[PDB]
Amino acid sequence: QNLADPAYRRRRIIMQNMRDEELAIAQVEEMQAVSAVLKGKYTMTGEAF
Amino acid sequence: MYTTAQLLAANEQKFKFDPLFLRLFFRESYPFTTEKVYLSQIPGLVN
Amino acid sequence: DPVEVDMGRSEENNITQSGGTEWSKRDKSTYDPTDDIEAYALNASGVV
Numbered sequence: 765q766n767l768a769d770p771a772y773r774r775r776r777i778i779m780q781n782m783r784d785e786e787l788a789i790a791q792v793e794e795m796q797a798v799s800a801v802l803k804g805k806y807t808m809t810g811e812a813f
Numbered sequence: 814m815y816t817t818a819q820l821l822a823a824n825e826q827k828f829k830f831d832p833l834f835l836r837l838f839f840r841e842s843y844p845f846t847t848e849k850v851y852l853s854q855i856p857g858l859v860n
Numbered sequence: 861d862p863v864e865v866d867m868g869r870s871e872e873n874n875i876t877q878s879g880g881t882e883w884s885k886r887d888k889s890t891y892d893p894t895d896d897i898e899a900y901a902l903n904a905s906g907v908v
Contacts, residue, residue, distance in 0.1 A: 765847060788859045824868075826905070 872903045 799806035877883065883893065901908060 784857070784859050791859060829902075 870903070873905075875900055 796806055796808070883891075
């Protein structure tokens with residue numbers, strides 16, 4: 765009933781994608797803490813690294 | 814004809830019914846302008 | 861001369877515990893009679 769331009773749709777996609785990347789950072793950030801105070805050891809290993 | 818009937822109060826037979834559902838769950842109301850209505854949801858799962 | 865009065869009571873307000881479940885065919889310790897109380901209080905036609 766109320767559309768918009770793909771330009772503001774592009775803005776929405778940009779904001780959503782920023783949100784997703786921030787969430788992914790916050791989530792992957794806890795991996796090292798989990799390893800650290802879960803074993804006293806940690807593995808920073810993954811493809812492209 | 815000589816009857817002299819004196820009428821007293823009546824009952825109500827009221828019911829035990831309260832919404833509890835539009836009053837607790839469906840609290841916000843929306844009229845319609847179209848015939849159909851969608852209900853979209855965004856499933857988010859980052860990696 | 862006899863004068864009969866139907867006060868307006870409904871039969872479902874005139875329950876008899878008759879059956880296999882009144883109160884004495886139960887364990888006094890394990891059973892809670894309040895269940896019967898609400899089962900009978902539904903047709904109360906107001907607060908009791």
